Each structure stands twice: as structure tokens, then as C-alpha cells.
Design a protein around this motif. Sequence first.
Motif, PDB file in Angstrom:
ATOM      1  N   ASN A 116      44.292  50.060  42.209  1.00 16.96           N
ATOM      2  CA  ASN A 116      43.417  48.928  42.477  1.00 16.96           C
ATOM      3  C   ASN A 116      44.167  47.910  43.325  1.00 16.96           C
ATOM      4  O   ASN A 116      44.851  47.031  42.793  1.00 16.96           O
ATOM      5  N   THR A 117      44.032  48.019  44.646  1.00 13.89           N
ATOM      6  CA  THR A 117      44.846  47.267  45.590  1.00 13.89           C
ATOM      7  C   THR A 117      43.959  46.654  46.660  1.00 13.89           C
ATOM      8  O   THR A 117      42.975  47.264  47.087  1.00 13.89           O
ATOM      9  N   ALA A 118      44.314  45.447  47.091  1.00 15.45           N
ATOM     10  CA  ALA A 118      43.557  44.760  48.124  1.00 15.45           C
ATOM     11  C   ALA A 118      43.757  45.431  49.479  1.00 15.45           C
ATOM     12  O   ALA A 118      44.750  46.120  49.726  1.00 15.45           O
TER      13      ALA A 118
ATOM     14  N   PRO B  51      39.384  43.668  44.170  1.00 15.62           N
ATOM     15  CA  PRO B  51      39.568  44.797  43.254  1.00 15.62           C
ATOM     16  C   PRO B  51      40.927  44.862  42.579  1.00 15.62           C
ATOM     17  O   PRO B  51      41.241  45.895  41.983  1.00 15.62           O
ATOM     18  N   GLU B  52      41.738  43.814  42.634  1.00 13.81           N
ATOM     19  CA  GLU B  52      43.111  43.907  42.166  1.00 13.81           C
ATOM     20  C   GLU B  52      43.198  43.734  40.656  1.00 13.81           C
ATOM     21  O   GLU B  52      42.356  43.078  40.038  1.00 13.81           O
ATOM     22  N   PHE B  54      42.573  45.435  37.953  1.00 10.09           N
ATOM     23  CA  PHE B  54      41.376  45.734  37.165  1.00 10.09           C
ATOM     24  C   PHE B  54      40.291  44.677  37.361  1.00 10.09           C
ATOM     25  O   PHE B  54      39.659  44.227  36.402  1.00 10.09           O
ATOM     26  N   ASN B  55      40.070  44.287  38.617  1.00 11.31           N
ATOM     27  CA  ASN B  55      38.952  43.427  39.006  1.00 11.31           C
ATOM     28  C   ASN B  55      38.930  42.127  38.203  1.00 11.31           C
ATOM     29  O   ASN B  55      37.911  41.745  37.628  1.00 11.31           O
TER      30      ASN B  55
END
Lengths: 122, 56
Positions: A116-118, B51-52, B54-55
Motif C-alpha cells: 500500500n504505497t503512494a 492508499p498508504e 492501510f488507507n
Amino acid sequence: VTLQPGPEDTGKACGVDYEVKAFCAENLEEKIHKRNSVRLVIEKVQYAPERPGPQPTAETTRQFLKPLHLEASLDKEIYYHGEPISVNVHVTNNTNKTVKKIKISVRQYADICLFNTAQYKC
Amino acid sequence: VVDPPRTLDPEKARGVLKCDISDLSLICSLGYSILLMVTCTVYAIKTRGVPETFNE
């Protein structure tokens, strides 16, 4: 793909890569010695499509609190590294406003989509 | 410090204890916090879909 390292980066770079490794062992799951091992790096690549696509064009209209209408287009869709990009702009201003400056830029977007990375934009 | 730390009788016959300050002082004190909340809400709605971690 390799992401550009910094001044003080020392070891392996960031990105995604492929390698082949040949080794000698009694069993596959137990141990890999450095002496009995050969590693080679291989690149998976893509190349430019042979058929050109449609001409890129864009249009916008902004009315303030008579509109201002902006149109922009490029000459071609697929460009090669080191070749110039020509953008044609056409602005009509029915308002009582005044456009001071026109800023044109070319920007890159990179999606790191495993954790989960920008997204990286520049 | 300008107004350092009374009985109020709203008709009837019994007076009720209160602090020296009116509630307008309380609302004026919350005036800055409401501006902080508005700023935080605007900043949290403009980002939204990040989205970083876990949102979060």
C-alpha cells in the motif's frame, strides 16, 4: 525498472529485476554455497508499437463567478527518447480577465502497486 | 488573567450557582477550535483516497 539512487545510496537499488542462478547441491531446499553458484542479470523489455494512435487533444471551458476557452493538442501520440514534443495551444478569452502566464510541463507518474504505497509523480 | 475565577436567578424563586463567566465566553473560547476543525476537515477531504498504511 530501477529508481534513481541518491548520493549516499550504497547497495542494491530499488525497483524490479530478474536474474538466473545456477548452483550445485545435494538437495534443492538445503543451502546454496557461494563457490558453487553463478548469477546473471537479464532484462525483460518492451518496444514502441508499430501503429500510431490518435492525436492527443484536450479542451476546457471556465466561466467565472462569458467563458474562457482553452484548447491544446500534440502532433503525435508515440514519441521516442530524445525527440522533441510540440504542443499547440489556442486560448480565447471572452471575459474581462487577463491571462498573465502560460506554464507548460512534461510530467512522469510511477505506480508502486505491490504494497500500500503512494504514487510517485514528478 | 483579565477575568480571574455567582448566583443566577432565572425567574421562579431559587437561585442557581454558576461560574462568573457567561456561556458566550465558552463559545468564544471554542471559536479557535472550530477553525481548527474546519481546516482539518478541508485537508482530510482534499486528500481522501490516499492508499498508504492501510488507507489511514
